[PDB]
Amino acid sequence: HMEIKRRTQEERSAATREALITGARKLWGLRGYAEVGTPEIATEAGVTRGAMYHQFADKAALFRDVVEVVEQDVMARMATLVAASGAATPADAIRAAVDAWLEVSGDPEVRQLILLDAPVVLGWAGFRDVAQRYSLGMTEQLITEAIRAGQLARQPVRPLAQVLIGALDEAAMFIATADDPKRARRETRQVLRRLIDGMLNG
Amino acid sequence: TQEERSAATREALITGARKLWGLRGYAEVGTPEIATEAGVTRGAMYHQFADKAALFRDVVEVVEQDVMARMATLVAASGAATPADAIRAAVDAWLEVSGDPEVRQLILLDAPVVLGWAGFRDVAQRYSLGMTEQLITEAIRAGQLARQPVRPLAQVLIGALDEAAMFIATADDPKRARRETRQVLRRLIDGMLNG
Numbered sequence: 001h002m003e004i005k006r007r008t009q010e011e012r013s014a015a016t017r018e019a020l021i022t023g024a025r026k027l028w029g030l031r032g033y034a035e036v037g038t039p040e041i042a043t044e045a046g047v048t049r050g051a052m053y054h055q056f057a058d059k060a061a062l063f064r065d066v067v068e069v070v071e072q073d074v075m076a077r078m079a080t081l082v083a084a085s086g087a088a089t090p091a092d093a094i095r096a097a098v099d100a101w102l103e104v105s106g107d108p109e110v111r112q113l114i115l116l117d118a119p120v121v122l123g124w125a126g127f128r129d130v131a132q133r134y135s136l137g138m139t140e141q142l143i144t145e146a147i148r149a150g151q152l153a154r155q156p157v158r159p160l161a162q163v164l165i166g167a168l169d170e171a172a173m174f175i176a177t178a179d180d181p182k183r184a185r186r187e188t189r190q191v192l193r194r195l196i197d198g199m200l201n202g
Numbered sequence: 203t204q205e206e207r208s209a210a211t212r213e214a215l216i217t218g219a220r221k222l223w224g225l226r227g228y229a230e231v232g233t234p235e236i237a238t239e240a241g242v243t244r245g246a247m248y249h250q251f252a253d254k255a256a257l258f259r260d261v262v263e264v265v266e267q268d269v270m271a272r273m274a275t276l277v278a279a280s281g282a283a284t285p286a287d288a289i290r291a292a293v294d295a296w297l298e299v300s301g302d303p304e305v306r307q308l309i310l311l312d313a314p315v316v317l318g319w320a321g322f323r324d325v326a327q328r329y330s331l332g333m334t335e336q337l338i339t340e341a342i343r344a345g346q347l348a349r350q351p352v353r354p355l356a357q358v359l360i361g362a363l364d365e366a367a368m369f370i371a372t373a374d375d376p377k378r379a380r381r382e383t384r385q386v387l388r389r390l391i392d393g394m395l396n397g
């Protein structure tokens with residue numbers, strides 16, 4: 001008897017939540033978390049303050065869901081760029097994935113939300129857990145494929161993956177906080193080329 | 203003097219807090235316990251430290267000073283004959299020093315949480331970036347690393363070294379994790395060193 005009512009209220013709640021996340025991603029992406037209040041976000045999203053209260057305990061809870069949706073888009077955008085790269089070998093896929101990370105992390109919205117705001121708002125523990133949840137699988141599979149092809153030494157995948165994600169996250173943070181980010185991106189790309197080319201047999 | 207008495211009170215509290223937080227972690231020991239360990243009244247303690255985080259900020263300074271000194275000592279004693287070998291010795295020194303139980307708990311686990319992102323990174327940079335940039339500069343000068351600005355390489359390598367230490371710190375089998383991580387780090391830097 002009550003399944004349509006329950007599903008209807010679920011769908012309405014989901015639509016409200018999506019509008020708030022979409023609004024918050026847009027305004028915080030342009031001005032930064034510190035500079036935009038939840039009332040402006042509720043106005044942008046076309047929802048009441050009570051609808052906001054119902055969905056999110058507080059401003060940081062809304063930000064935690066923004067980061068989830070952005071990280072899903074970052075991982076999808078990176079997969080698209082590697083897929084489109086023309087990579088002939090697992091080693092070339094790895095190089096395409098590093099290039100994709102510098103391109104996607106360079107998007108001004110990703111820079112603001114993931115590299116500048118997220119470490120501050122989530123705290124160090126929260127940021128590291130999100131980055132590993134989204135990126136460890138892709139990174140490990142790229143390593144497994146290169147090992148299978150004899151382009152990387154046979155070794156435990158997890159330690160290498162975690163160390164490389166540490167290096168790549170700090171590379172992107174360096175570019176994000178540079179006052180001349182075009183020069184920083186060149187210099188950082190050049191470092192990562194030497195690091196990756198030092199490890200790959202191909 | 204009044205300044206000497208204040209300094210003695212502060213030293214008792216920083217020593218006590220370093221000992222107790224180093225064993226159980228910041229979250230698990232309150233300021234009353236620390237004041238009892240130090241033999242200091244609550245009022246004398248709050249006169250020197252506004253709150254728990256303030257006391258932790260001074261613990262982090264004395265631990266970072268020991269990390270920096272122990273890193274210098276071990277690299278100096280390694281017998282490294284070239285800048286490339288000093289870099290290799292610094293990698294092994296970092297796994298030895300960061301494996302100290304007090305460093306593991308206070309610097310690797312607690313400091314990023316208590317000080318916050320910006321705070322912890324400012325402290326770490328103040329104590330480390332001197333040694334790090336000198337090691338890199340000497341290797342570039344010797345032609346054992348590519349010609350390049352120092353800072354970008356330093357930040358990327360610090361990201362690898364920090365994640366290596368945190369991997370070991372939370373591992374189910376830290377002795378195994380340290381062997382696996384040492385192999386990864388030595389292979390990463392051997393790919394870039396000419397010598």
Ligand SMILES: N=C(N)Nc1nc2ccccc2s1
Pocket residue numbers: 266269270271273274296309326329330333334
């Ligand atoms: N990682 C830290 N949080 N602190 C330090 N690391 C190092 C590493 C080498 C030399 C001095 C220092 S101080």
Ligand SMILES: N=C(N)Nc1nc2ccccc2s1
Pocket residue numbers: 292293296323326327330331334360363364
């Ligand atoms: N500064 C950091 N955030 N961490 C580290 N710096 C250094 C520098 C040299 C060796 C190990 C490490 S670990």
